Design a binder for this molecule. Structure first.
Ligand SMILES: [Zn+2]
Lengths: 49, 90, 89, 76, 64, 88, 74
DNA sequence: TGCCGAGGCCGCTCAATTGGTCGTAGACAGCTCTAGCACCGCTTAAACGCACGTACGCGCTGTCCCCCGCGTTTTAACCGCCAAGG
DNA sequence: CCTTGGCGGTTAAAACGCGGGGGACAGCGCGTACGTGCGTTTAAGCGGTGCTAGAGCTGTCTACGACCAATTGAGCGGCCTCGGCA
């Protein structure tokens, strides 16, 4: 047994990790390179209706 | 004969002869008796096991020589009680 | 100075280690060349035998099993490794 | 416990050492020699860890503890 | 089976909060408080009804 | 640290034979050990004579002290025939 | 001291001549060598004795000395 | 037939060169210590033979505790099931 | 309908009793070469001046290499071009 250090996984931290996912692994995860790219689930600019 | 066979084999190889898990438990137990919940790098325990097995093997060489000196083929307590004394361990 | 002395170890990096080890207050002009020459000899004597034993046995690379078999054999340098233990892990 | 150093592991080690036939009163002795060796090396490894203000005994603390017994260990 | 539980209690010595771990061994009726920081350890008897607040209460009275 | 030069000497002594990745760490701990032993011993020598500069002469004596016999002879001949080739 | 000191000095100067020439010795140096040598030999004889007794031999033989020296790592 | 493997160019970070202090390292002198090497008188310590004794070693015996194989079986350690809650 | 509290099911091997069968521990017999206390005689060992000087101890002097401070050149990694095997 060892002392674990759980730190918060901020959106910005996760955002950079997602852009480095390869196209071949993007497909295998059921996402889609043209229409549903996985880093687009994080919001950086909000559309104003 | 099978004894000789094993000696030809083990002396040929270099894998650790004590089970990993058990050794990890012994080390952590003993260490726990000096300082509570001490965390260990895996390499630390590995270092301890390499050192311990090299030590025991050498000890068994000397022990063997002590047994053979007394015209015996079987290692006993009087062998180690002698090897370790001459080593300055006791 | 390493090619100029026709050596293979850097007199520089080792000298930097000496500065960082703080083994004295001031080094000499030619003390690290001698220490790198001497060290270089020990490496080119151990690896010369590891490369002789890899081709004597028939091995291609050099494994730690080759180092453990050589340095505890070869009474030339088996005295340097009376109290050493190659981990093999 | 020390009982994890089993009978056939001490026998295997003896086989590596060159022992032919081994009497029964040697495993306990080995268990008692191995425990002294670990109590001498782990004390120095824990001393280097408490000196380094750590809580994890790394492998270089074990290499330094074996170096303080004339048992230099290469590969860590 | 033993229960290893983290708590939100403050260690009475090092004062780090949310760093006290409680190990309750009901098979032998022995509860164990541990810090994760200074790692001070404290043992106390537990019943079957006890919870991390029961031994942490016994630790407050064992100091005072 | 010293692993980049072990392969460079190995290319001279055996340009055909390669080396593993654990054996490079073993030769690198061997080099950092015989370095911190020769420099340590030399440091002891520079203190016993109350000097302040480690010259090549305290290295030649620490090589004579540490290495036994023919390894010290050969060790002192290679350092001498490297310092003389250096000064020229 | 159990060895004639002078004989230890002779032998010493002879052996020393084979390492470095025209050497001179402080008397205390030779004395140091003799204390060390005799202490070493005595301890060795203790261990040898133990080997002999181990082999139903309380009386040391060359075999005993050789065992002792082998286990010492000499 | 053409793009990823390798060498070249533009930045990064640490190494190499130069100038002023600066106390510590090297010189050097005065001078007393214990090592210098040569001879006496006496003595504790050493070279060589003894001999019946205690220890050192070879051979035969008892019975006896580790020798080798098999089978599940159990801790320790990796992979899937009971039936309560939110 | 989904995921934890404790519980069977999941292996490499040893927890080895215990059936079999023999290497070899310690006591006992004989048995021989070597082996030290005491004995002789000795050649070196312990303690004292006499003589003679090498270099340590300690003192102040003169001195050359490192510390930390501004310059600035080469090795290495990230772009970026060139090129023959598939
Ligand atoms: Zn605390």
């Amino acid at each position: 047994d060892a002392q674990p250090e759980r730190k918060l996984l901020t959106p910005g931290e996760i955002l950079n990790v997602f852009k480095h996912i390869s196209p071949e692994d993007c497909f295998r995860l059921g996402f889609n390179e043209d229409y549903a790219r996985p880093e687009w689930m994080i919001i950086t600019v909000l559309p104003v209706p | 004969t099978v004894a000789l066979r094993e000696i030809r084999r083990y002396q040929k190889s270099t894998e650790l002869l004590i089970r990993k898990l058990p050794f990890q438990r012994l080390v952590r137990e003993i260490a726990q008796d000096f300082k509570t919940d001490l965390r260990f790098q895996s390499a630390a325990i590995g270092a301890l096991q390499e050192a311990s097995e090299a030590y025991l093997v050498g000890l068994f060489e000397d022990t063997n020589l002590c047994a053979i000196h007394a015209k015996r083929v079987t290692i006993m307590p009087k062998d180690i009680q002698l090897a370790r004394r001459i080593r300055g361990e006791r | 100075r390493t090619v100029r002395a026709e050596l293979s170890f850097s007199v520089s990096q080792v000298e930097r280690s000496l500065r960082e080890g703080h083994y004295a207050q001031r080094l000499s002009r030619t003390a690290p060349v001698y220490l790198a020459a001497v060290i270089e000899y020990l490496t080119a004597k151990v690896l010369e035998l590891a490369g002789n034993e890899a081709q004597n046995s028939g091995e291609r690379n050099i494994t730690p099993l080759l180092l453990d078999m050589v340095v505890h054999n070869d009474r030339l340098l088996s005295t340097l490794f009376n109290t050493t233990t190659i981990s093999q892990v | 416990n020390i009982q994890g150093i089993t009978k056939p592991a001490i026998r295997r080690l003896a086989r590596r050492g060159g022992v032919k036939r081994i009497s029964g009163l040697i495993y306990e002795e080995t268990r008692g020699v191995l425990k002294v060796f670990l109590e001498n090396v782990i004390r120095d490894a824990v001393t280097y860890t408490e000196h380094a203000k750590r809580k994890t005994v790394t492998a270089m603390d074990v290499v330094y503890a074996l170096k303080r017994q004339g048992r230099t260990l290469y590969g860590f | 089976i033993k229960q290893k539980l983290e708590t939100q209690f403050t260690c009475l010595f090092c004062n780090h909060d949310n760093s006290v771990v409680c190990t309750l061994d009901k098979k032998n009726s022995i509860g164990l408080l541990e810090c994760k920081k200074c790692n001070l350890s404290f043992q106390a008897p537990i019943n079957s009804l006890s919870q991390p607040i029961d031994i942490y209460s016994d630790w407050i009275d064992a100091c005072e | 640290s010293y692993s980049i030069y072990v392969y460079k000497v190995l290319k001279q002594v055996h340009p055909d034979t390669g080396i593993s990745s654990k054996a490079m760490g073993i030769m690198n701990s061997f080099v950092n050990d015989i370095f911190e032993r020769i420099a340590g011993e030399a440091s002891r020598l520079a203190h016993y004579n109350k000097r302040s500069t480690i010259t090549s002469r305290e290295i030649q004596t620490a090589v004579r002290l540490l290495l036994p016999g023919e390894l010290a002879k050969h060790a002192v001949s290679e350092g001498t025939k490297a310092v003389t080739k250096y000064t020229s």
